[PDB]
RNA sequence: AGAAGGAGGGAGGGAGGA
RNA sequence: UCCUCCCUCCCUCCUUCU
């Protein structure tokens, strides 16, 4: 029954409006950490269970970070970019300087590292 | 440690009155009391705070970390009308799935005189 | 996406008081 | 002229939670 990083992203993506929003990014981060730790299934199941509770798909993504334990243990991934323009418009409003040991299950999706040295966290 | 006392501790930390966390405090202390686990629940509450967690966070950690809250259904609370539910919880009401889990944020189930049931969901 | 708390503000309904 | 209570609705700020 095992699912693919490919189609999970597909599914979760089907469920959200907009393009390149903080939640599309969060989908990407969840699936990557998903693959590399062999939890794409645990993760799909929590996504479904949260929709059953009545959670908006945004909220469901959030529940994964808070309920699937891997995400309390892997830091938000660093993503090397040139400049802040490279980040999608929808995410612009959600960038914040990151504090020490930023946690995914606290809303820190990823860390954008630009070529001027400045790092900006994507905060949900 | 006592149920009455611990509720008052937990409350003294919470913002507002009549919020979902106030309801959760009552559920936690009720379950803790029926089951002789107030000591465990209090320790975990204090432990969360020491890690620097918000009191709201600490209550959630109890539901996730003290195993009893994985193994019992959300309490059924019987009420006259929906208007009997405090203002702060109103926007948090929603229909429960079949086996709502307390450790999934389902604080309790309000059963009205009409037989209709809404879960309080955090 | 949504909720709670505090703060600032703007519009309109019902009532009561100075 | 002002105040209080309740009911809609709109904007911004801080914190918390899912």
Curated annotation (Swiss-Prot), chain B:
<comment type="function">
    <text>Plays an essential role in viral RNA synthesis and also a role in suppressing innate immune signaling. Acts as a polymerase cofactor in the RNA polymerase transcription and replication complexes. Serves as nucleoprotein/NP monomer chaperone prior to the formation of the large oligomeric RNA-bound complexes. Regulates RNA synthesis by modulating NP-RNA interactions and interacting with DYNLL1. VP35-NP interaction controls the switch between RNA-bound NP and free NP and thus the switch between genome replication and genome packaging into the nucleocapsid.</text>
</comment>
<feature type="modified residue" description="Phosphoserine">
    <location>
        <position position="99"/>
    </location>
</feature>
<feature type="cross-link" description="Glycyl lysine isopeptide (Lys-Gly) (interchain with G-Cter in ubiquitin)">
    <location>
        <position position="91"/>
    </location>
</feature>
<feature type="domain" description="VP35 IID">
    <location>
        <begin position="1"/>
        <end position="122"/>
    </location>
</feature>
<comment type="similarity">
    <text>Belongs to the filoviridae polymerase cofactor VP35 family.</text>
</comment>
<protein>
    <recommendedName>
        <fullName>Polymerase cofactor VP35</fullName>
    </recommendedName>
</protein>
<comment type="subunit">
    <text>Homodimer. Homooligomer; via the coiled coil domain. Interacts with nucleoprotein NP and polymerase L; VP35 bridges L and NP and allows the formation of the polymerase complex. Also interacts with VP30; this interaction is regulated by VP30 phosphorylation. Interacts with host IKBKE and TBK1; the interactions lead to inhibition of cellular antiviral response by blocking necessary interactions of IKBKE and TBK1 with their substrate IRF3.</text>
</comment>
